[PDB]
């Protein structure tokens, strides 16, 4: 199970830009579409699901993609604010960033013997941008690639 | 031993959010 | 006004339990548990009732062995 | 043909004679037996159907029985032939035998023994006194690839002929295919090659009548006989292998579990046999001792189950075991050797006389048919109850104690549909609050109180709060053997939490309360064995019918529950009773853990932490 009547704004949307009866819409006016759904991907995200759409070059897609990358947007936006909401549980002082010291709070209040060092090397290893902590885009990124969710 | 290592700080970090989305599971329970 | 009359179940706190997730998860398909009442007791439509006493009936099957 | 109630119809083929009080037996056609236990000429009626049928249950008075091909054989080479069978048997019907039964017992009956195999020389023949079966098994596919090849690869030619020594197990199986079962019967006093030993019986050593019974059941007209004997644990099952090995004198091999099931057999061996302690050798990683002049060699499966490279000393001692021809060979916990690699052992090791003992025979995956044949027939089972009755091993006092679920771990319980749901009923609040006083009652009556958790994590947990030494994974052996001791020595610490490890890692102490939390999940042979080697015989309660105590913790509407009943299946095969004890006199009073339902939930969240 999926959805129930979500899917039907979807079909709206694809038969918005299948107005010929085609079958299939144009991968261009992708953006759009999304943006008939609510969705607003940057340049970079409309350009990799270009690539992973239109693999082929046949430059469009069909219905039952077109759902299917919609349900995974809507399965990914919910994660992202799942994701947000702990990162907010966290940085419950709304300093932006999962610092140390949000980290050690954290680890104290869930009772864990998460030794400092190895707090400070989590933070490490989820540092990129070498900030000396973990920001918003960091905790996503790593927890993009978690073991499980 | 990089790999181990560096997969042993994603469990860590595994743990502690199943442990807080489990907490707060607990408390909209009950609050 | 907005007052049901329908079939009440009184059970313990683990079949309580039971017919919650029954409710939630969609088991039963149908959200035919509209509402409870009491910490004991619920409120059903009494056209799902039998069917859910049949979704017991397995339950306390499952918890047992055949001979 | 079938009523329609569903009752077999055996009234028809079966004439009843007037003779029914008098004879207590039941034959029906299917091949079951049924016997009252009430009537005056039980104890003869008992041991005839000992001596040729397989018990099956042994409640309080009516027993039953099955008859199979195998429980033929082995009453066969006991030396009993079919009109002796068949007059006792109509002595004792209630109605006249069914001339299928009687068919049945003649066919097997006529065929037993008749094909020999002989390991002389390192090699092995097969050889009879009908050339026309051995010439006519020969059109046998399977029987042409087991049979030994020459240099070129031609067939080898009462003359026997050579057998490949990988391919017994083949033969093995196929003869019975063959309908031609092999004879596994020693020349225990015409030995030539292997020499006796000076190993005798020490005047310490006292057989009770059923050990005396089964020994000389198996020493059929004084030739020693492969095949598989049944005790409850320390019912003296390792001074009746140890009685069997000075019998024999010859040449002796043992096989244990663990280590220290070795260091047990080594012990009982010097406690009850003359064998200088420069013939025993125990063929393990740690204590490695020289295989040469070792008259007894105790090893474990796995020393020789090793098919990846051993050490450099370990092979040499291997290539001196398979050279050594050997006159005994005994095998202990029997329902682990239908395994694919302690199977190969069988074929690996070359002897005479294999002999084996195990507390049960229930294996789960059904491989017991084949052990048939592995090893041998079933010699003997001694019967619960009346070994109960005599005293000899403590009379238990067993119970399924039911815990309610706390709401919150029922719904999560619910929720979850994979094979996670473990952690949770074994984790249940009220189990834990009904473990506790259970422990504080027993304790409070000064008793041994060992605690089973197959789930590692449960143990700890439970372990930890209730503050008392546990063992699992690791066991470091000194610190294991530590907390052995304390248990036994020390009365401030009465209360050890052991793992699945207690099942044969080691040695348990002689116990009386034994509460079982966790199971594997249907090991219906397993967590019984495990009941039987906890609680021993102790003196001071012999004549009251409880003095041993066993509790089983089961959760109630999870699917424990379904794993108990078809668990204790087996001890209800030997009539032990479980009363279900829904709620504990006397935890209202005192204070225990969990009482109020804030630390439950917190709880819930540790155990939900483990997903
Ligand atoms: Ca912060
Ligand atoms: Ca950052």
């Not at chain 4, 030619?157 to 033969?171: A, D, N, P, R």
């Not at chain 4, 070994?387 to 771990?409: H, R």
Request: with cysteine; net charge neutral; aromatic share 8%.
């Amino acid at each position: 199970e999926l959805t129930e009547e979500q899917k039907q704004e979807i079909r709206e949307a694809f038969d918005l830009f299948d107005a010929d009866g085609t079958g299939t819409i144009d991968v261009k006016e992708l953006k759009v579409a999304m943006r008939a759904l609510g969705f607003e991907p940057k340049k970079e995200e409309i350009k990799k699901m270009i690539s992973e759409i239109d693999k082929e070059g046949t430059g469009k897609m069909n219905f039952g993609d077109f759902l299917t990358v919609m349900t995974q947007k809507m399965s990914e936006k919910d994660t992202k604010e799942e994701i947000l909401k702990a990162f907010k549980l966290f940085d419950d002082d709304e300093t932006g960033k999962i610092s140390f010291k949000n980290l050690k709070r954290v680890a104290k209040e869930l009772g864990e013997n998460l030794t400092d060092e190895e707090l400070q090397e989590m933070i490490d290893e989820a540092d990129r941008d070498g900030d000396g902590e973990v920001s918003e885009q960091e905790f996503l990124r790593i927890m993009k690639k978690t073991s499980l969710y | 031993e990089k790999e181990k290592k560096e997969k042993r700080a994603l469990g860590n970090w595994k743990l502690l959010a199943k442990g807080l989305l489990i907490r707060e599971r607990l408390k909209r329970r009950y609050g | 006004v907005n007052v049901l009359k329908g079939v009440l179940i009184e059970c313990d706190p683990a079949m309580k339990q039971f017919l919650l997730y029954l409710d939630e998860s969609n088991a039963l398909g149908k959200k035919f548990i509209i509402q409870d009442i009491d910490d004991t007791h619920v409120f059903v439509i009494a056209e799902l009732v039998n069917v859910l006493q049949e979704r017991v009936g397995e339950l306390m099957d499952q918890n047992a062995f055949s001979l | 043909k079938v009523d329609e109630y569903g009752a077999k119809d055996y009234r028809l083929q079966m004439p009843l004679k007037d003779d029914h009080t008098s004879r207590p037996l039941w034959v029906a056609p299917d091949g079951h037996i049924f016997l009252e236990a009430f009537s005056p000429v039980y104890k003869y009626a008992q041991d005839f159907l000992v001596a040729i049928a397989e018990p099956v249950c042994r409640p309080t008075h009516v027993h039953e029985y099955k008859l199979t091909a195998y429980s033929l054989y082995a009453a066969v080479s006991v030396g009993l032939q079919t009109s002796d069978i068949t007059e006792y048997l109509r002595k004792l019907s209630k109605t006249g035998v069914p001339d299928g039964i009687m068919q049945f017992i003649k066919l097997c009956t006529v065929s037993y023994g008749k094909v020999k195999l002989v390991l002389k020389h390192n090699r092995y023949f097969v050889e009879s006194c009908h050339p026309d079966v051995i010439q006519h098994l020969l059109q046998d596919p399977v029987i042409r690839e087991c049979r030994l090849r020459n240099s070129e690869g031609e067939a080898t030619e009462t003359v026997s002929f050579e057998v490949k020594q990988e391919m017994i197990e083949e033969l093995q199986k196929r003869c019975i295919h063959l309908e031609y079962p092999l004879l596994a019967e020693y020349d225990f006093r015409n030995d030539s090659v292997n020499p006796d030993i000076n190993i005798d019986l020490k005047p310490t050593a006292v057989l009770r009548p059923y050990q005396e019974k089964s020994l000389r059941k198996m020493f059929g007209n004084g030739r020693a006989r492969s095949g598989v004997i049944v005790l409850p644990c320390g019912a003296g099952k390792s001074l009746v292998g140890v009685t069997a090995a000075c019998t024999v004198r010859k040449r002796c091999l043992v096989l244990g579990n663990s280590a220290v099931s070795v260091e047990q057999w080594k012990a009982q061996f010097k406690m009850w046999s003359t064998i200088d302690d420069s013939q025993i050798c125990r063929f393990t990683s740690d204590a490695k001792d020289k295989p040469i002049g070792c008259s007894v060699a105790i090893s474990t499966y796995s020393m020789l189950g090793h098919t990846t490279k051993r050490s450099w000393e370990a092979e040499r001692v291997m290539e001196w075991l398979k050279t050594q021809e050997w006159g005994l060979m005994i095998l202990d916990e029997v329902h682990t050797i239908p395994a694919k690699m302690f199977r190969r052992v069988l074929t690996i090791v070359q002897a005479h006389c294999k002999l084996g003992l195990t507390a049960t025979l229930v294996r789960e995956d059904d491989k017991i048919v084949d052990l048939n044949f592995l090893i041998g027939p079933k010699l003997y089972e001694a019967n619960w109850m009346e070994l109960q009755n005599n005293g000899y091993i403590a009379k238990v006092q067993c119970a399924e104690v039911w815990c309610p679920m706390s709401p919150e771990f029922y719904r999560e319980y619910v929720a979850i549909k994979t094979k996670k749901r473990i952690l949770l009923y074994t984790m249940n609040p009220n189990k834990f609050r009904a473990c506790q006083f259970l422990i504080k009652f027993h304790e409070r009556r000064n008793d041994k109180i060992i605690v089973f958790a197959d789930n590692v994590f449960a143990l700890k947990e439970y372990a930890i709060r209730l503050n008392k030494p546990y063992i699992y994974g690791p066991t470091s052996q000194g610190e294991r053997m530590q907390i052995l001791q304390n248990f036994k020595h020390n009365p401030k610490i009465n209360t050890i939490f052991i793992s699945k490890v207690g099942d044969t890692s080691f040695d348990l102490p002689e116990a009386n309360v034994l509460i079982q939390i966790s199971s594997h999940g249907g090991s219906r042979r397993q967590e019984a064995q495990r009941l039987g080697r906890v609680l021993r015989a102790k003196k001071g309660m012999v004549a009251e019918e409880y003095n041993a105590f066993f509790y089983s913790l089961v959760s109630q509407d999870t699917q424990e529950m379904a794993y108990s009943t078809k668990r204790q299946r087996f001890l209800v095969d030997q009539g032990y009773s479980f009363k279900v004890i829904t709620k504990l006199a006397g935890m209202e009073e005192e204070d225990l853990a969990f009482s109020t339902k804030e630390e439950q939930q917190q709880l819930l969240q540790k155990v939900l932490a483990a997903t």
